[PDB]
């Protein structure tokens, strides 16, 4: 499904990303926007054999298992298929593990290039949450 801006905002908040390890809700909304345009089925095959799945494009070389990637590790111990559901639970749970690393959100390239440093608060602007 394709979430609406405020809808995802309310969703991510209920799923507890707002101010998770210091990252404001806007950061997560902004990242989802540039990473997948709020599409839970967003999929991208990378030069190697990995693929990014979900609203946050989690990679199949490190975080999830898609059965066709060389050197996979499945750190989130989840099928890559579960990161495509309309229920963002698994996607949020994995994202929390990812950001809990030293380089935090920098793990999301789209976020670095388009959200990092910017006033991401505008992304939840206008939402009554």
């Amino acid at each position, epitope marked *: 499904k394709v979430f609406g801006r405020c809808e995802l905002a309310a969703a991510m908040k209920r799923h*507890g990303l707002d101010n*998770y390890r210091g990252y404001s809700l806007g950061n997560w909304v902004c990242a989802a926007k540039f990473e997948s345009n709020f599409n839970t089925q967003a999929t991208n095959r990378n030069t190697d054999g990995s693929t990014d799945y979900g609203i946050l494009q989690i990679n199949s070389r490190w975080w999830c298992n898609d059965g066709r990637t060389p050197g996979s*590790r499945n*750190l989130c111990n989840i099928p890559c298929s579960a990161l495509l559901s309309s229920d963002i639970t698994a996607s949020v749970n994995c994202a929390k593990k990812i950001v809990s*690393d030293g380089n935090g959100m920098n793990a999301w390239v789209a976020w670095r290039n388009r959200c990092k440093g910017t006033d991401v608060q505008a992304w939840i602007r206008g939402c009554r949450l």
Partner: antibody
Amino acid sequence: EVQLQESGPSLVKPSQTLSLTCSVTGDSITSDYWSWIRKFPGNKLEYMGYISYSGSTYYHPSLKSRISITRDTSKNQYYLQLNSVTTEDTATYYCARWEMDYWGQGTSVTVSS
Amino acid sequence: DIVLTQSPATLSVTPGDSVSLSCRASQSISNNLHWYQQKSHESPRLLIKYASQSISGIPSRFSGSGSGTDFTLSINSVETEDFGMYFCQQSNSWPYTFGGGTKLEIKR
């Protein structure tokens, strides 16, 4: 499924450094996030710290930079080293996976001269 | 740091009846609150993660609810092996911290 187990001296002297080993089976050490939690005699639990994939670690400020958490290069075991201990460090130490799902049985260590 | 307070520190219960355990945070932590069961000579066992997400192999009688600063672990129809120590812990901000715990003991 993964299995974990702590091991190291049960007695450590004040000012000496405390070291413990956590052996893991069922999942690669470099393939995950690992933790150390301690439980004091009064039953209170303290989260000591963790190391993640980039090799980055997070230590609890309550430890005043006395803690070091390292992973072995090839044995599939990570370690806990705590400097300048006192009797306040007397406790049961547990290593567990960051997921908080799998824990080691826990091992006791007393600090006394 | 975020302080987690659990009250009462001790709770008496009669097998068959239900109980609710409280865990309050000094700061809102959203859903980043987990519940553990700990028996003597044993490591903590994870019961519920992220305030209400259930864990595989945990009796369905255990359930968690709450958000922000007020959380609750519910044990429907308490059984003999449910007795021991219950702790809550937050992972919203570093350092992760634990609540002081609530003792679940047998009423007689």
